[PDB]
Amino acid sequence: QDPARSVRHIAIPAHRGLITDRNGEPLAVSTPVTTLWANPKELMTAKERWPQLAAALGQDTKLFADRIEQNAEREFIYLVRGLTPEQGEGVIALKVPGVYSIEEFRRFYPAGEVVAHAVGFTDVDDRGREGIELAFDEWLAGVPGKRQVLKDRRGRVIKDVQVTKNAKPGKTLALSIDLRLQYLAHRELRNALLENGAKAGSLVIMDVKTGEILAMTNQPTYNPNNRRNLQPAAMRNRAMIDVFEPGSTVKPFSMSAALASGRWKPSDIVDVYPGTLQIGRYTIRDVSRNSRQLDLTGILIKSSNVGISKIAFDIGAESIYSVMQQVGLGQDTGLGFPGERVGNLPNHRKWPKAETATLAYGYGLSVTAIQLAHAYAALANDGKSVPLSMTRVDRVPDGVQVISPEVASTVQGMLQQVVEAQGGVFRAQVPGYHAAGKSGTAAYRSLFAGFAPATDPRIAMVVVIDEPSKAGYFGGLVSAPVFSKVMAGALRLMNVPPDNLPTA
């Protein structure tokens, strides 16, 4: 016979660590629940109790009975996982022979859909599946304990023996996300999609000095507390997973290389007439073709592919590739989110003219919205690229000085003109502040990337609107007004003073 007594092991689930926003607002909270297990050998002695037990478990009478009967020779099965503690005590109070309980936890997400992708969610086993819950799973999960119970020959629990290993609680995590800014970004991106009839979109806000991600929202979104019917489209963390060719939004990096070469200054003029440039078989074409001479700021205002290409041929692709690589376009962010996409930054030993030109005006490389925002953050932070963080930064790390402060300041002023000057991106203007930025077109994505205050930058932001299909309230670039609204609120939520003084 089997021994009259045996010492069996039961895991002790650990309490998963609290996730908060940067201000301590709870974002993911472990909630006590009760799991019930049973010894079928004992249940088989108390069959008249089964229907009441099945009812208390929310299970069908006959499906429940079938399950016990088919497991009659086992000494352990789960009856139900994750009942409320109240529902649990109700089941336990039936006093059915062979019914036992385990204290576990399940997550609740107080901000729900507002921060769905960034926070992510746990699986049925309380394990991180998406977002920060996934990226920091080991930190948040801790380590289960193990305890021993004395059982008899038929698996009846006689008593607790001891705990052999205590559970190590999961550890707390404060995100860089500011829920105040995340709500503003979530609301405005949702409104922009509705008014533009768009498929999807993303918005990222970064602190340019600290590398912190202050907001990251995508549409569609979902309620992580109720995923019954959640469609895969909604679950996608587009800001980190969708790659696209950034188009004219990378011209400022080409310009930074031009100004660093020693060969170009902002007042220089390039003749871009007639809005095309033939290089062998290939023709470089501007979208708008109403220009002849443009200064360097003009090339940006007009999104002149021709103009930036002539500059690129003069300075060489290598110098542009170097800046783009160093600011992180097509490069690992270091954020450690499994499944994050890196995109691609093409390299060559001998750069063909077509590849040089297209790199310079943003085709042939592919990036994510996070990378684009980090790149603009370096430009905004006087050329210093601080590593990205999704967690609160108290001690600011050194950044790599990727662009000289002087070149960065010059480009900031050019991008301020892109927003402010006649012919520029009118609806990107941020009332009460000077803002700086650049539009582009990634079945298209509308892109806007920028920062503010333009003369002393604090915040960088990228807006991506995927496949707009309906006319919005304002004309012009679809993503521009979203930048305007979100930047206006974010700057004020952060108490950033206006930089548009009357000449002081």
Same domain, 388 and 495: no
Q: Is residue 377 part of a domain?
A: yes
Measured between alpha carbons, how far is 171 from 19 in angstroms, rounded to an integer? 9
Same domain, 32 and 136: yes
Measured between alpha carbons, how far is 198 from 59 in angstroms, rounded to an integer? 42
> How remote is the C-alpha of 232 from its chain's centroid?
16
Count of structural domains within the chain: 3
Contact 171, 178 (CB under 8 A): no
The identity of residue 114, as a single letter, is: V
Structure tokens at 433: 């502040």
Phi, psi angles (nearest 5°) of residue 107: -80, 145
- Torsion, Cα 181 183 187 190, to 10 degrees, reads 100
Measured distance between the N- and C-terminal CA atoms of the chain, rounded to whole angstroms: 94
The identity of residue 239, as a single letter, is: A
- How far CA 67 is from CA of 54, 72, 104, 498, in Å, comes to 11, 9, 23, 68
- Catalytic positions are 248
Residue ranges making up the domain that contains 351: 237-418
Interacting residues of 48 by C-beta distance below 8 A, sequence separation 6+: none
For 495, counting Cβ atoms within 10 Å of its Cβ (0-12 exposed, 13-18 middle, 19+ buried), the class is exposed
Q: Rounded to 5 degrees, what angle do the CA atoms 242, 248, 249 make? A: 60
Q: What is the 3-state secondary structure (H, E, C) of 159-177?
A: EEEEEEECCECCCCEEECC
Q: Is residue 232 part of a domain?
A: no
Conformation bin of residue 136: beta by default, left when phi > 0, alpha when psi is -120 to 50: alpha
Interacting residues of 387 by C-beta distance below 8 A, sequence separation 6+: 211, 334, 397, 399
Interacting residues of 492 by C-beta distance below 8 A, sequence separation 6+: none
Same domain, 412 and 435: no
Same domain, 13 and 85: yes
Half-sphere CA count of 492, side-chain side, radius 13 A: 11
Please say whether the dihedral angle defined by the alpha carbons of residues 187, 190, 194 and 197, taken in this order, is positive or negative: positive
For 377-418, the DSSP string reads: HHHHTTTEEPPPBSB--SSPPP-EE-S-HHHHHHHHHHHHHH
Using only C-alpha atoms, what is the Rg of the chain?
Answer: 29
Contact 353, 279 (CB under 8 A): yes
Measured between alpha carbons, how far is 476 from 304 in angstroms, rounded to an integer? 17
> Which of 384, 418, 452 is the C-terminal boundary of a domain?
418
Count CB-CB contacts under 10 A for residue 150. Answer: 15
For the chain, the maximum distance between any two Cα atoms, rounded to a whole number of angstroms, is: 97
Same domain, 94 and 219: no
Same domain, 453 and 309: no
Angle between helical axes of 369-380 and 405-420 (0-180°, round to 10): 110
Element (H, E) at 500: none
CATH of the domain at 249: 3.40.710.10
Count CB-CB contacts under 10 A for residue 334. Answer: 12
Residues in the chain: 504
CATH of the domain at 487: 3.30.450.330
For 59, counting Cβ atoms within 10 Å of its Cβ (0-12 exposed, 13-18 middle, 19+ buried), the class is middle
Reduced DSSP (H G I as helix, E B as strand, rest coil) percent helix, strand, coil of the chain, to 5: 35, 25, 40
Same domain, 150 and 190: no
Which of 434, 436, 444, 448 shows the shortest CA–CA distance to 476?
448
Q: Is residue 228 part of a domain?
A: no
Q: Is residue 229 part of a domain?
A: no
> Which of 397, 418, 439 is the C-terminal boundary of a domain?
418
Same domain, 407 and 428: no
Task: Output 143-146 pairs: Cβ under 8 A, ≥24 positions apart.
Answer: 143/14, 143/167, 143/168, 144/11, 144/12, 144/13, 144/14, 145/11, 145/12, 145/14, 146/9, 146/10, 146/11, 146/12
Same domain, 129 and 192: no
Structure tokens at 60: 């069908």
Interacting residues of 13 by C-beta distance below 8 A, sequence separation 6+: 102, 103, 104, 105, 126, 144, 167
The identity of residue 324, as a single letter, is: M
Q: Is residue 140 part of a domain?
A: yes
The residues with which 6 forms a beta bridge, in sequence order, are 151
Same domain, 377 and 270: yes
> Which of 383, 399, 418 is the C-terminal boundary of a domain?
418
Map tokens 């498929």 to a residue. Answer: 199
Exposure string of 66-77, with b = 16+ CB inside 10 Å and e = fewer, is: ebbeebeeebeb
Structure tokens at 492: 């004020």
Q: Is residue 230 part of a domain?
A: no
Strand, helix or coil for residue 272: coil
Measured between alpha carbons, how far is 201 from 472 in angstroms, rounded to an integer? 15
Count CB-CB contacts under 10 A for residue 168. Answer: 13
Same domain, 309 and 181: no
Q: Is residue 62 part of a domain?
A: yes
Please say whether the dihedral angle defined by the alpha carbons of residues 30, 31, 32 and 36, taken in this order, is positive or negative: negative
The identity of residue 55, as a single letter, is: A
Q: Is residue 250 part of a domain?
A: yes
Same domain, 110 and 191: no
